[PDB]
Amino acid sequence: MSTLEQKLTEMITAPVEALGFELVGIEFIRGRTSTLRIYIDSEDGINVDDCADVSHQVSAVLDVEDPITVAYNLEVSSPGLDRPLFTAEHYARFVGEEVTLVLRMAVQNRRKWQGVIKAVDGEMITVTVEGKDEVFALSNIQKANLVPHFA
Amino acid sequence: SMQDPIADMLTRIRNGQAANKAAVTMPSSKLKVAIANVLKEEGFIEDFKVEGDTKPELELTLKYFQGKAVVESIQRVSRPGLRIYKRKDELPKVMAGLGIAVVSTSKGVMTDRAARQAGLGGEIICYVA
Amino acid sequence: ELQEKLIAVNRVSKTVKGGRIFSFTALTVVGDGNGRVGFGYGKAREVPAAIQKAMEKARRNMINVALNNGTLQHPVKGVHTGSRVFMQPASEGTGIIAGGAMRAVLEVAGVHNVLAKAYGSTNPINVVRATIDGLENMNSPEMVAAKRGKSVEEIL
Amino acid sequence: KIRTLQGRVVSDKMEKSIVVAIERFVKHPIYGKFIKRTTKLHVHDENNECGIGDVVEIRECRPLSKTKSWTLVRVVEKAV
Amino acid sequence: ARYLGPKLKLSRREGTDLFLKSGVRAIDTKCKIEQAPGQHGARKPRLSDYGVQLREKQKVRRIYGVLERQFRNYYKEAARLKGNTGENLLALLEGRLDNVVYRMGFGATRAEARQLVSHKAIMVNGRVVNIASYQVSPNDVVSIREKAKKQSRVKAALELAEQREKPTWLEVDAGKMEGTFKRKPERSDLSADINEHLIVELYSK
Amino acid sequence: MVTIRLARHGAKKRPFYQVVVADSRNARNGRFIERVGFFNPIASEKEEGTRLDLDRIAHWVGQGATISDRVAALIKEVNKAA
Amino acid sequence: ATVNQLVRKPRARKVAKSNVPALEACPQKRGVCTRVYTTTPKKPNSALRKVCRVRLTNGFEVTSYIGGEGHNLQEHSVILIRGGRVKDLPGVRYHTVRGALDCSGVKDRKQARSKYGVKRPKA
RNA sequence: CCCGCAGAAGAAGCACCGGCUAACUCCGUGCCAGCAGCCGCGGUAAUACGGAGGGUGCAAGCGUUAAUCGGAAUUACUGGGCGUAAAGCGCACGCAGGCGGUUUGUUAAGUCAGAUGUGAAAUCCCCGGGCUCAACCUGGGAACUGCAUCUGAUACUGGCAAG
RNA sequence: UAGCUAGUAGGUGGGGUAACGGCUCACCUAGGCGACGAUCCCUAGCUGGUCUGAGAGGAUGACCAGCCACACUGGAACUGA
Ligand SMILES: [Mg+2]
Ligand SMILES: [Mg+2]
Ligand SMILES: [Mg+2]
Ligand SMILES: [Mg+2]
Ligand SMILES: [Mg+2]
Ligand SMILES: [Mg+2]
Ligand SMILES: [Mg+2]
Ligand SMILES: [Mg+2]
Ligand SMILES: [Mg+2]
Ligand SMILES: [Mg+2]
Ligand SMILES: [Mg+2]
Ligand SMILES: [Mg+2]
Ligand SMILES: [Mg+2]
Ligand SMILES: [Mg+2]
Ligand SMILES: [Mg+2]
Ligand SMILES: [Mg+2]
């Protein structure tokens, strides 16, 4: 579910927002390594060095207000060529590009398919798979990535 | 199943000299005698002797110099599980020629030195030292 | 007129009720450069003591090897406490080609030309535990002649 | 003096020819243990005159079939 | 391809004489021969056997001036020959043409002698040669080309040679400035400070 | 055919000729049959640059071997060399 | 392990799995970073590790440590990579070269500059 | 290639200095960072980060990476193991296979000895020779451990026969 | 990767070839190969040598020399020693 990702979002958003930078995706992985990955969006561009600047500030606010008490690991990242889209708004920004997605349910006929965005709605995203303009509820999608292909 | 008499004969000396016996004996054989004779005159023992007819046994008088056995390391090289032959020129040397390698040739059994004297390869049986 | 050489020093612990108490173990050999050599190893609270006392035990225990002309008389190996050491005489002026620990042992004894090699574990005390024995097990061209009751050329 | 080999037939189910198996005792390349290796053949059995196991003697000749290149020269034991 | 820094720093590093100056003065008069160079050059470090080996190698190199790669060639060839390797190593090191000239006292310092060879001033067996590493053979007769037989440096170096021990294997005639490499020098014919056995040990690592 | 000719060896600007016999169809430094001597154009009296086993040659030309004109001259030399 | 067992089964030897597979014996490879990111270690160790996801000419996407002190890289920055493994990094078996192919020449370094491409400053 | 000319005149750099591993301090430096082949390093001082001085190595080169062997006895033929570290099948029977007491004869296969043929040249190695040296080139040799054939040798192992 | 093969294995005859030969064909026989690895699959030009190694080995076949193979792909022949 959400490991109080809400607070994680606010805690990261504040310093990131202070940097004039936009925040896009927050992901945390526990067990394999208690490492958090952050996706950021700078229009001018995103060097590693800036990622270090935000990694330090976020680390600072993370240190005092962290009650999860997990191992303290977290990496700062800038969108890859294959970039995850979490908001309906993110789907909206990538109007016409291929996005792969996997349904949370592992039952047969699960939507483990990729498509090209045709229209974007809040609860429902239209992506074309098998020549069909399908609509998907993002809440029921386990994980999704955009344009893994490099051109 | 005793699939080698010679190795046994040797260990009977190694486990003999170790146990500090005065003398050891084996079920004889025309080969072992030849094995004994050469090392016998090579000072590594005092004397051997064989008696009996239907089951002749060979019997050896071991050696000790100063509370220490003269022979002290024995190893059968060409063994039933893996034979060994050497040409004339590649005749080995035991402890830089201080030891002795007993080899059989078509001309019989003798030390390695005698072999490379006659210039005869053969089958390396044992390293003695 | 002797000759000495430290080999290795380790700091060993000893856990007591409150914490621990370190110490120092030295290890050294002493030879006369003439085929006669011993080794010593002694603990102490601090280095110079250990290096001192261990140095002294080695002044006893000095066996006398029958080498010839700064080189051995025949290849020889010696195995002690899980360490295997092969050695063999070398040509004139070849030198002392040996791992660290052995080199001193060979040096102080009086050896000049020798090939060598260790095997298995390379714990220094073990290899010298494994070397001097190998050394004394050499045999003169007359120790045999005597023990074989023959003349020297009668073997050579 | 002609050269020749001395094998031992293993089959004669074919018209006027036999399958001799030679046996060469060779020392292993690396491991030094001597071993025995066989080299089957296809010898022309003129007259079809050899049983099985009967040790024979052969000789190399011009090709006579897709397989055979060997002529029998005698029999040294007739398959007791 | 030749060391061109200060000279005495080496001796002060190798802690001995190396005959790197003409010798009209004593070393201490010109440096702190007893003490290594540099800020920390005063303190006496606790080196290692390996350090000993290296330090002896750099010595015989520096006392002769052979760079590294050219050196081990001498070694890798010296080992190939018969006799005691490290022994004959020095023997051929004693064979470098310049060194012979230097031994013949035509040049005070070997470099000075080397500069002569490099400057086409010496003929072995009547014919000119200008490679310093030119090995020499017994009975060879080096000489001075007349274009330099009147050089001020050659006469002064000859006046400095007899202040040192007259080598045996090679015989000279300072009258007309030409000598004879009669015999290949022997180990004893050299010094004794050199430990050739450890020099072999080093490369045999 | 089978000829006696010169294969080139030595180094740049310093050539050395091994006089060999070979099938003419083979490259100048390809396979051959019986090397029968050598030639050195730049001997300059430092060392011999013409050694020939002309009898072996004679044996070959005897059985139909032909001669490169260069070595044909070379042969003429050793005969004049006597 | 008797000889008669060796003749029936010779001794084998496992291959040397290349710790630098994405190089295929090439001393270097050209690549384009498909992502740029930094990673801090656990609570006890505080440090920043620069590292890029880069697709190679051979088609592999890997992780290469950013040498540091030069950081001008972002998505679609070509870069040359060499095989170097730093301790404290789990999957980083490669180091980006510093001083060629779309990597900033690091600010003046008076020492070991060749390992960063910095040319000898001409005073 | 030689001769002449002028003038030190036109020509030195790259790594590294905690240990391994030859070579050390100063100043920042603040666990910020950065360093890293490994172990590791960094605090109010760090001989390990940066600069500086000094030093070590190598040199028209010097380092990094890659690749192969070595080190590695870490596939152990030479030259490892298997009570507890990884490793004895749950046990047995048994074909193929491997191995085989003792005496004589015979055989000559293995084996050994010898001869003969062959094993291209180059390469490697020894002794030379030639480019001023060297690299390089070259004479001659050695060697190419092999294979085949012939003639021997019979202790050994095998075959055969008789015990 | 455990079975593999019917021109397959062999013979007789004819044809064919510079030449022997299932080379081809007729005919007959029913074989032939395989755990001493057939068959199948992946990889690869081979060697003299080359690098390493104290050695035995390991690696490798760039240059040079020997041999083989190929010449856009696939197939076929003609001429000709
Ligand atoms: Mg040079
Ligand atoms: Mg040091
Ligand atoms: Mg190995
Ligand atoms: Mg083990
Ligand atoms: Mg069990
Ligand atoms: Mg049973
Ligand atoms: Mg049997
Ligand atoms: Mg038997
Ligand atoms: Mg050859
Ligand atoms: Mg010469
Ligand atoms: Mg028999
Ligand atoms: Mg027909
Ligand atoms: Mg016909
Ligand atoms: Mg080895
Ligand atoms: Mg090529
Ligand atoms: Mg035609």
Swiss-Prot record, chain A:
One of its GO terms (cellular component) is cytosol. One of its GO terms (biological process) is ribosomal small subunit assembly. It comes from the Bacteria. InterPro entries: Ribosome_maturation_RimP (IPR003728), RimP_C (IPR028998), RimP_C_sf (IPR036847), RimP_N (IPR028989), RimP_N_sf (IPR035956). SUPFAM superfamilies: YhbC-like, C-terminal domain (SSF74942), YhbC-like, N-terminal domain (SSF75420). It is found in: Cytoplasm. Required for maturation of 30S ribosomal subunits, probably at a late stage of ribosomal protein binding, while Era is associated and after RimM. Associates with free 30S subunits, but not with free 50S subunits or with mature ribosomes. Belongs to the RimP family. PANTHER family: RIBOSOME MATURATION FACTOR RIMP. This is Ribosome maturation factor RimP.
Swiss-Prot record, chain B:
GO terms for biological process: cytoplasmic translation; regulation of mRNA stability; regulation of translation; ribosomal small subunit assembly. GO terms for molecular function: rRNA binding; structural constituent of ribosome. Keywords: Repressor, Ribonucleoprotein, Ribosomal protein, RNA-binding, rRNA-binding, Translation regulation. One of its GO terms (cellular component) is cytosol. Pfam families: Ribosomal_S8 (PF00410). SUPFAM superfamilies: Ribosomal protein S8. It comes from the Bacteria. InterPro entries: Ribosomal_uS8 (IPR000630), Ribosomal_uS8_CS (IPR047863), Ribosomal_uS8_sf (IPR035987). One of the primary rRNA binding proteins, it binds directly to 16S rRNA central domain where it helps coordinate assembly of the platform of the 30S subunit. Part of the 30S ribosomal subunit. Contacts proteins S5 and S12. Belongs to the universal ribosomal protein uS8 family. This is Small ribosomal subunit protein uS8.
Swiss-Prot record, chain F:
Induction: Part of the rpsP-rimM-trmD-rplS operon. Pfam families: Ribosomal_S16. GO terms for molecular function: DNA endonuclease activity; four-way junction DNA binding; structural constituent of ribosome. The keyword Phosphoprotein does not apply. The keyword Ribosomal protein applies. GO terms for biological process: cytoplasmic translation; ribosomal small subunit assembly. Keywords: Endonuclease, Hydrolase, Nuclease, Ribonucleoprotein, Ribosomal protein. Gene3D superfamilies: 3.30.1320.10. It comes from the Bacteria. GO terms for cellular component: cytoplasm; cytosolic small ribosomal subunit; small ribosomal subunit. Disulfide bonds: none annotated. Belongs to the bacterial ribosomal protein bS16 family. In addition to being a ribosomal protein, S16 also has a cation-dependent endonuclease activity. In-frame fusions with the ribosome maturation factor rimM suppress mutations in the latter (probably due to increased rimM expression) and are found in translationally active 70S ribosomes. Part of the 30S ribosomal subunit. This is Small ribosomal subunit protein bS16. The lineage of its organism: Bacteria, Pseudomonadati, Pseudomonadota, Gammaproteobacteria, Enterobacterales. The gene is rpsP.
UniProtKB/Swiss-Prot annotation, chain G:
Keywords: Acetylation, Antibiotic resistance, Methylation, Ribonucleoprotein, Ribosomal protein, RNA-binding, rRNA-binding, tRNA-binding. The modification 3-methylthioaspartic acid is found at residue 88. The modification N6-acetyllysine is found at residue 107. GO terms for biological process: cytoplasmic translation; Group I intron splicing; maintenance of translational fidelity; positive regulation of RNA splicing; response to antibiotic; RNA folding; translation. The keyword Oxidoreductase does not apply. Part of the 30S ribosomal subunit. Contacts proteins S8 and S17. Interacts with ArfA. May interact with IF1 in the 30S initiation complex. This is Small ribosomal subunit protein uS12. It comes from Escherichia coli (strain K12).
